[PDB]
Ligand binder design. Sequence first.
Ligand code: NA
Length: 419
Amino acid sequence: LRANLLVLLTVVAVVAGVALGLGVSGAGGALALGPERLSAFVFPGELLLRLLRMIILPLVVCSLIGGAASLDPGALGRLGAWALLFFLVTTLLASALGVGLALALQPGAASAASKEVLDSFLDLARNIFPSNLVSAAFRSYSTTYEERRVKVPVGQEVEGMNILGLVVFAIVFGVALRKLGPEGELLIRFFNSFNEATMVLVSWIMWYAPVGIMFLVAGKIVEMEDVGLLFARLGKYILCCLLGHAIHGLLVLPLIYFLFTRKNPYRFLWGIVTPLATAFGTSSSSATLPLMMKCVEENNGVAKHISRFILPIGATVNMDGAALFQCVAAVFIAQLSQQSLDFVKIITILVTATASSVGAAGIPAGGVLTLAIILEAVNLPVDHISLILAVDWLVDRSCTVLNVEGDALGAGLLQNYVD
Ligand code: NA
């Protein structure tokens, strides 16, 4: 049966990728391979990432326009308000859990070894309302400084898709098309057709997902080295992050889903195994978004409009795992510096992590850079980020899995709420 066949292929691909990476590293690794052969070996994962990122723009734009244009403005507003409330509550719970685990386990007991806040939030506001749509299709506004010796911000458009601005524009355009009446109907049809066509492409790219995922992990454990030393250095911190992610994903979110929707939450999770493993392989929520929409619509009973309206918004707003990681890292650095944490400091770490989780730049370091602003919100040293960079390759993937899982569970919860 194909639904189980794809899951079996994905699991086999992940296991074989880990085994192949360990074998290649044990046979000589990158030194035996060389940089040319290393890039050639990694290439299929890069190809999968390119295929996933190619169809992000038409999928998101058409899906959001169709979803907004298919609901009454009051109903759409209420649905969006409920979705935002769910996202905020889940992010707060994730941050609180991360802080609690970091304080309980004390990963900083071993002691064996940028952009401003206001500019970051102004950049977020600028990215919400893009200056140019075609430019927003592949560029985002970022603030840089010039020493005019007082530094002043300048800002320019740097590479990287502006998903948030496209999402906002698509929602507003769908609302306008709904308001038009008959005149807009044709356009709605057009966009709907376009979206369906993109879905067909996904149904093919999905079948290449396992073969890529294997390589996408194998090279990732071949490029790295000194696994034992890094684990001996940061075992407590890695355990804190991974345990927080596991508790939030396997206990808290399914508990909320069961409380609000009496159905089995793990049966729901079984239907999105492939997008979750794709998120782990790629470490990007936007790239695994199309597969998650496909699985949520097909494997689960979520309605088309609800899924295509909630999942694109959550893919940019809901970042539970990132908030958990940032809170854990901030607390860990606080214990490293022998500096006690105040209750006000806990409140502000929670609030800052939740606020800065929204609208991630999307680059692999985007979370890490975020922590810097966080560590500039409350006075803590920012050099220690170096050791955090030693293992970010795995923590980021663990974060991405949780980011997309929260989206899927929220879509299911809202679908039940409408029912
Ligand atoms: Na997300």
